[PDB]
Subunit: 157 residues, 3 copies
């Protein structure tokens, strides 16, 4: 199966997309209500928005890719009064990036994400989306590096 979904509890779901090489945590944080098919589909759409934002910034498949990487971590849904989501993403730049190259990657990425995630508007799920972007630096050529290392999800599990 291309996507493997698991309930750790009614309101905490792991979603591993093999085909696209992504991993996200789904949380129904505010209400603690059980995740439904709609919530998971919403999460899949935001996972797609992030990999599409990544594709706009540069192809992360090419060998020697110099970054940045934009990676989804968690979609936290607030379904108490209205339908809202907070998407947590990591921006990963190379340890060898200069002050300006970082400020540049950060602004470009935020622009792409505001568009792809439909920030501050209601989307095709009638969900209004916001995001938070954590910044990381890593030696991108290191054998120790993977854009979705398990460590990067500790906040959410």
């Amino acid at each position: 199966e291309s996507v493997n979904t698991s309930f750790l509890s009614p309101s905490l779901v792991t979603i591993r997309d093999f085909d696209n090489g992504q991993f996200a945590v789904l949380r129904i944080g505010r209400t603690g209500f059980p995740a439904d098919k709609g919530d998971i589909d919403l999460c899949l759409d935001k996972m797609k928005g992030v990999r599409d934002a990544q594709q706009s910034i540069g192809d992360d498949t090419e060998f020697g890719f110099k970054g940045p990487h934009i990676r989804i971590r968690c979609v936290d849904i607030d379904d108490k009064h209205t339908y809202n989501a907070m998407v947590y993403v990591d921006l990963i730049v190379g340890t060898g990036a200069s002050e300006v190259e970082r400020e540049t990657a950060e602004e470009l990425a935020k622009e792409k994400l505001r568009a792809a995630l439909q920030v501050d508007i209601a989307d095709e799920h009638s969900c209004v989306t916001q995001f938070e972007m954590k910044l990381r630096e890593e030696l991108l050529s290191s054998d120790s590096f993977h854009p979705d290392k398990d460590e990067y999800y500790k906040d959410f599990l």
Copy 2:
């Protein structure tokens, strides 16, 4: 329609999307790994609980005054024989007299005994009992859902 996950050999989460239910399957006494039969059993007890519910009243209709009968956990004892303890919540609105509460419990207990086939060997040769926890909630609140995660704390 149904998503099943093994948190450990003996602890399984079962999310039924179609019927909007969630149950924890636990093989409590022995700690033996859950097999397809145990999952089938859990699914059939989930069906029994929602059947009991519909017998008390449709929980789909807006305005539904309650009460809610919700499955939480199916604990299987497969040591010598095949037994199951089904943990359910009976959820009553906070605006309900004590006469109404006990009256709703009794009506609940009676529907569960029939639907879960309590004290008899069922289609899976399983002998079933249940334990029912009483909760009161403002059914109309935006912060209420019959299967809120907090209701599962004791089984996860």
Copy 3:
């Protein structure tokens, strides 16, 4: 026939119903997310273990006196090259002589070296090692199961 769940990106439970097995897959050294190849690798090591089991004796035979060889965990190291550590349990009848244990232990170790392709690159280009834990249980006790949940505590 197989149920796979991600507890985290690098920790997967795998329940094989048809062959009655359970294993924890972890990408220990790197913490990298498990991919389809890693899971397929785990399934191959699970198969190696049950083939080793059939070598030592049909565990599906009634009154099966033992021993049991059971997979617990496959820990993948994919940092520089592709390697796997397979954690297994050897379970002997609690009433066996020192020499009968010794014989069981060396026969399982040999069948496993072969079945898990120890020290050589396998069909997934992975180089495997294993680690064996010794157990004894009353194999006829109703409280006994080769894959009891207690046996995976080190890994979950």
